[PDB]
């Protein structure tokens, strides 16, 4: 029983301790619903943390580390009970254990703690976890251990309120630059996800990732054989192109757009959607970035998805079309018209998502304003597909930004 285990674990004799801690570990590792709360309420935590100090019994340190790992794998309340028992400094000590199993289990426990949230992450960082963790990365490290190191690196990079300290990012990026050349799929997935958390952290963090030199190693993973790697890379580069035009151009200069036909035609609708989101952030750029999308032969594929994709993908394609009109030239917008954008675009005017309706009306207004003389040809195309009747109906929409624009479009372009 738990009472018994706690009684034995509190003994001064390390072999009685070992028996008890192994029994607790087995309770916590034998199925996917361990009795975490019962073990916390029993009072075992400070005892287990005390066991971590016993360099004279590495088996006891290992068992205690595995037990605490699994308690910390639970809810935030369970992880925080481990942290409140002073586990973190003792695990950081065990990163220097001569015993491989103890060191690896300490890494794993710290991963669960760091993963709980940003303040917990920042406590562990402040105590110096990053340097010894990255010191493990070597040619001789066993691959299972390296996979766990890289997973902890994800947890160091994630969570955004606040993001991890700049100095930590500066320490982690050279290690990610090494790991991105690994061939192991699990290492690559984690490495790229860690990068994607950094590129979502803000424009200064995007710039740090760019300045590391890693982007040309990241872009070709869009065509990796493993779909998990491809989509991690799509997130990582996608976050970069939420930045400035110059930051976006770093990604385009790696020929990123040549990787997109196989993502836009991918069987998985979620990948189509994610790919079109990326492209919508390209077409929001300057005229040269708009032209890059045209020259990669992607516009017909976007328009196909606008018409025949799943609704989630259609919404993204609507953004890609409207955003082109921000800085696109008259001739680039004319190309959209020639590619039969107007009917599937207008078909989104009636949906219940007011954000999409606004995007489409904004793009139609910009298209009409840009076609100085051709405004009548385009107006006729909008009328022909029922787009004009749909705009007239939007004069009765709930949302003022929508209905105002519907009145204005009809007054400016259909009141002759």
């Amino acid at each position: 029983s738990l009472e018994a285990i706690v009684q034995n674990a509190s003994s001064d004799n390390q072999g009685i301790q070992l028996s008890a801690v192994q029994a607790a570990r087995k309770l916590l590792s034998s199925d996917r619903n361990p009795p975490i709360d019962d073990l916390i309420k029993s009072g075992i935590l400070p005892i287990l943390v005390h066991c971590l100090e016993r360099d004279d019994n590495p088996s006891l340190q290992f068992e205690a580390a595995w037990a605490l790992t699994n308690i910390a794998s639970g809810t935030s309340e369970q992880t925080q009970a481990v942290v409140q028992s002073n586990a973190v400094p003792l695990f950081l000590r065990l990163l220097h254990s001569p015993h491989q199993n103890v060191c690896e289990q300490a890494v794993w426990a710290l991963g669960n703690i760091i993963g709980d949230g940003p303040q917990c992450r920042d406590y562990v960082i402040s105590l110096g976890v990053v340097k010894p963790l990255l010191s493990f990365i070597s040619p001789s490290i066993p691959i299972t251990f390296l996979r766990n190191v890289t997973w902890v690196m994800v947890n160091l990079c994630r969570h955004k309120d606040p993001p991890p300290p700049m100095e930590t990012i500066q320490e982690i990026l050279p290690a990610l630059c090494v790991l991105i050349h690994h061939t192991d799929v699990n290492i690559l997935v984690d490495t790229v996800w860690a990068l994607s958390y950094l590129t979502d952290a803000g424009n200064e963090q995007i710039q740090m990732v760019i300045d590391s030199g890693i982007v040309p190693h990241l872009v070709p993973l869009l065509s990796h054989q493993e779909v998990k790697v491809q989509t991690a890379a799509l997130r990582a580069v996608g976050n970069i192109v939420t930045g400035t035009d110059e930051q976006t151009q770093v990604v385009l200069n790696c020929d990123a757009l040549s990787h997109f036909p196989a993502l836009l035609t991918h069987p998985k609708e979620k990948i189509n959607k994610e790919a079109v989101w990326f492209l919508s952030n390209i077409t929001a750029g300057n005229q040269q970035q708009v032209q890059a999308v045209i020259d990669a032969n992607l516009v017909p594929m976007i328009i196909h998805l606008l018409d025949k994709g799943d609704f989630g993908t259609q919404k993204e394609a609507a953004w890609a079309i409207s955003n082109l009109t921000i800085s696109g030239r008259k001739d680039q917008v004319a190309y959209l018209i020639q590619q039969n954008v107007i009917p599937p675009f207008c078909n989104l005017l009636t949906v219940k998502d007011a954000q999409v309706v606004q995007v489409v009306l904004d793009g139609l207004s910009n298209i009409l304003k840009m076609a100085e003389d051709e405004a009548e040809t385009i107006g006729n195309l909008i009328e022909e597909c029922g787009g004009l009747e749909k705009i007239e109906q939007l004069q009765n929409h709930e949302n003022e930004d929508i209905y105002k624009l519907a009145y204005e479009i009809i007054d400016q372009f259909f009141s002759s």
Binding site: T69, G74, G115, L234, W277, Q358, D362
Partner: peptide, 24 residues
């Protein structure tokens, strides 16, 4: 409200777990 947009809800849902138990 045209322009660049951050990653949207529901995208990239297969993120690495924050926490993992060692199970036998």
């Amino acid at each position: 409200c045209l322009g660049r947009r951050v990653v949207q809800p529901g995208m990239f849902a297969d993120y690495p777990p924050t926490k993992k138990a060692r199970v036998l």
